[PDB]
Each structure stands twice: as structure tokens, then as C-alpha cells.
């Protein structure tokens, strides 16, 4: 969590499952091979306040 | 605060270090510690925050 800073907000998070076509690492491949994840889930201010 | 650094680096491996960590080392003010700062903005300085 991240009070106001803009450049410390996180946009993605995404998984590896493979590689992408003849590199071994996975701190090479994971840049480019990932799966964003992620789901938004509404509330009720009123109920809240 | 505490007595002793290499307790001090014990104590900071369960504890977060998301804004970093100041040390002092030259005279502290009421012993040897380190400093935490939280994630508060300032804003008395107009181009940037």
C-alpha cells in the first residue's frame, strides 16, 4: 500500500507458466510471458459511512 | 532504539523496509538506532512533492 506517491502506485501483477522461444532464464522471459491477474469488487459507501 | 546494531538488523528481517532506513553512527541523539520515516508527503516546496 502507497499513501499519494504516483511512481510507487502498482499497475499490473502478472505469473509466468513458459518460456518464450530459446532463452533459459526466467528473470529474461518473465517480462514478456506473463498473465496479468487481477479482479475489481464494488462496494456501498453509505454502508461504509 | 536499541543497544546494539546486529540486534537491530535481527529485528528488521520481520519488519518492512518499503521507505528505507536512516542509521546515524557519529554521536546518536539518546543512543544507538535507527530511523523509520513514514510515508508522508511534504508540501512546502511548489514544483514537485
Known amino acids: 500500500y502507497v499513501r499519494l506517491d504516483r511512481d510507487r502506485v502498482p499497475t499490473m501483477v502478472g505469473v509466468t507458466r513458459q518460456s518464450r522461444d530459446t532463452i533459459t532464464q526466467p528473470a529474461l522471459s518473465l517480462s514478456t510471458t506473463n498473465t496479468t491477474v487481477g479482479v475489481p469488487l464494488a462496494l456501498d459507501a453509505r454502508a461504509i459511512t | ?49
Open chain 2, 1 to 49: 532504539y536499541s543497544d546494539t546494531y546486529e540486534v537491530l538488523d535481527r529485528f528488521f528481517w520481520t519488519h518492512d523496509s518499503s521507505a528505507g532506513v536512516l542509521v546515524h553512527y557519529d554521536k546518536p541523539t539518546n543512543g544507538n538506532h535507527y530511523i523509520l520515516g513514514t510515508l508522508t508527503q511534504m508540501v512546502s516546496a511548489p514544483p514537485h512533492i
